[PDB]
Structure 1
Amino acid sequence: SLRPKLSEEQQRIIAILLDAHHKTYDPTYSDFCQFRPPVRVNDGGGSVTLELSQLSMLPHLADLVSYSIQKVIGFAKMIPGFRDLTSEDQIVLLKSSAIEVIMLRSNESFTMDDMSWTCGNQDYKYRVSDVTKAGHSLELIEPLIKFQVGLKKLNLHEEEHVLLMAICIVSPDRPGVQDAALIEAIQDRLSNTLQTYIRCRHPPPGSHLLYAKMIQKLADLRSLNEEHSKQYRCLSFQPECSMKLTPLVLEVFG
């Protein structure tokens, strides 16, 4: 019912987050030529044995994810209040949310035109088959695609999109966090900003219930995180896999 106006502080928070995202997410994907080249071996059969023997798309995707983790770290550092946290808690939050924020932010390159993450010419267009060529199984990919479509259909404003990523990162319920209270205080400030923004700036019929739907996506991400971790473990058993990854990836998921 009540639709309070965004406070000056809440307006500043949104402005800061939009700016942080614009500085850490390049919509032209111009740095991609700097990653190890994507290689797509013939695997129409989806052979796990062949996929693991080659891991043809792993160097490229590992570089893409590593690059993205760096961007997420940069984004996180700009989240109002994040700097108030101890270095130890900052790292805990970053490592635990990295893959989740990558899945969220990737929605910007995801397209329902053909259910792919399109970052340019065919070379940088990623489909389910490209992810299997990196060593992952459909147990992760299919649910991930479903998540992308569900997120797409929420038609989030960029303001809502950046707030959701910030809320995802600043979560008090991450194993290893020391000052949960402070983290929750920061998250509540972000959550209240999001709730207020939706109530006074998001037109119907895709509003209000929108907050609940967004919070539900955060729960969905936890499941995807767990599944990705299980599969990363398997992938790491492959001899010489470390060289196909990056130091940052090895640490975050190791």
Structure 2
Amino acid sequence: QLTAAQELMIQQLVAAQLQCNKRPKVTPWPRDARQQRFAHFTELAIISVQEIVDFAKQVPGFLQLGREDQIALLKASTIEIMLLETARRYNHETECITFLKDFTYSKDDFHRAGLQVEFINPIFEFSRAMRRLGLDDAEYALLIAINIFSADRPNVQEPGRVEALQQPYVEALLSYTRIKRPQDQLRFPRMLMKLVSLRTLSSVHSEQVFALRLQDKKLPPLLSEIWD
């Protein structure tokens, strides 16, 4: 059963998301060009951040939070929301990512703005895994809102309230996926599991030079010892 409350809420989510996108002054897509490209992407991100602020203000429940927690929520989730939105715009065929519905970008374009391959591959890796899933726009809208309302982000002063406001969007995703693919039942938990790997991706962008990890291939000798 989609409740009338749900069915209206998802319409508001999807319309809020559309009304974001259709809202050019950006340095045109082309040393100078590799900088032009880099600044191109910088401005792509800048607009992205503002979209995500405007989407959020329209998520029932959001503007009811304390202003501090609103900000704390958006700080923490911007890069996860950017990632999810990019997966949303990933075209699996052309193997390309479409920004401002129109401009198309492949690995190579990103490498050529001088970008960290070590982070472009994860991006792409994420987009393809999301593709398998077959999300629609309601599903991403809903996944985003759930992602906005994470009680565990730093500087949340009212986590229990954040956590109560999350629940509406967890129920609606739960019902939407039960109606959409009723013979599956693991598509719901699989979507939510991407929020897990999505948190690890995110923490890699912001990694501190004093807390860099990555061991690579080679096995831990001492753990292997313990193993047999």
Which bracket does the TM-score occupy, shorter chain normalised?
A: 0.7 to 0.9
Runs of 4 or more off by more than 4 Å in structure 1? none
Matched, 1:184 2:180: no
Equivalent of 1:60 in 6, 30, 40: 40
CA shift for structure 1 position 70: 0.5
> Considering only aligned residues, what root-mean-square deviation do their CA atoms show, in Å?
2.4
What pairs with 1:27-38 in structure 2 (closer than 5 Å)? 33-38=24-29
C-alpha change, 1:98 and 1:9, in structure 2 (3 Å) is same
**Ranges in structure 1 where 5+ consecutive residues have no aligned partner:** 43-53, 234-254
What pairs with 1:4-19 in structure 2 (closer than 5 Å)? 5-19=1-15
The alignment partner of 1:153 has SS state of: helix
Equivalent of 2:195 in 184, 197, 218: 218
1:167 alignment partner in structure 2: 146
**Ranges in structure 2 where 5+ consecutive residues have no aligned partner:** 210-228
C-alpha change, 1:120 and 1:183, in structure 2 (3 Å) is closer
Is the CA contact (8 Å cut-off) linking 1:110 and 1:118 kept in structure 2?
A: yes
1:39 and 1:195 mapped to 2: Cα distance?
A: 44
Is the CA contact (8 Å cut-off) linking 2:21 and 2:100 kept in structure 1?
A: no
Q: Which amino acid aligns with 1:57?
A: R
2:26 and 2:100 mapped to 1: Cα distance?
A: 14
1:202 alignment partner in structure 2: 180
| Cα deviations by residue, 1:180-232 (Å, 9 ceiling, x for unpaired) | 00000011111011111111x21355x4201111111111111121122249x
1:59 and 1:14 mapped to 2: Cα distance?
A: 35
Equivalent of 2:129 in 129, 136, 150: 150
Equivalent of 2:52 in 72, 79, 96: 72
1:81 and 1:12 mapped to 2: Cα distance?
A: 14
2:7 and 2:98 mapped to 1: Cα distance?
A: 32
Is the CA contact (8 Å cut-off) linking 1:115 and 1:145 kept in structure 2?
A: no
1:219 and 1:55 mapped to 2: Cα distance?
A: 34
CA shift for structure 1 position 40: 8.9
Among the aligned pairs, what percent are the same residue? 33
2:195 and 2:37 mapped to 1: Cα distance?
A: 28
2:225 alignment partner in structure 1: none
1:103 alignment partner in structure 2: 83
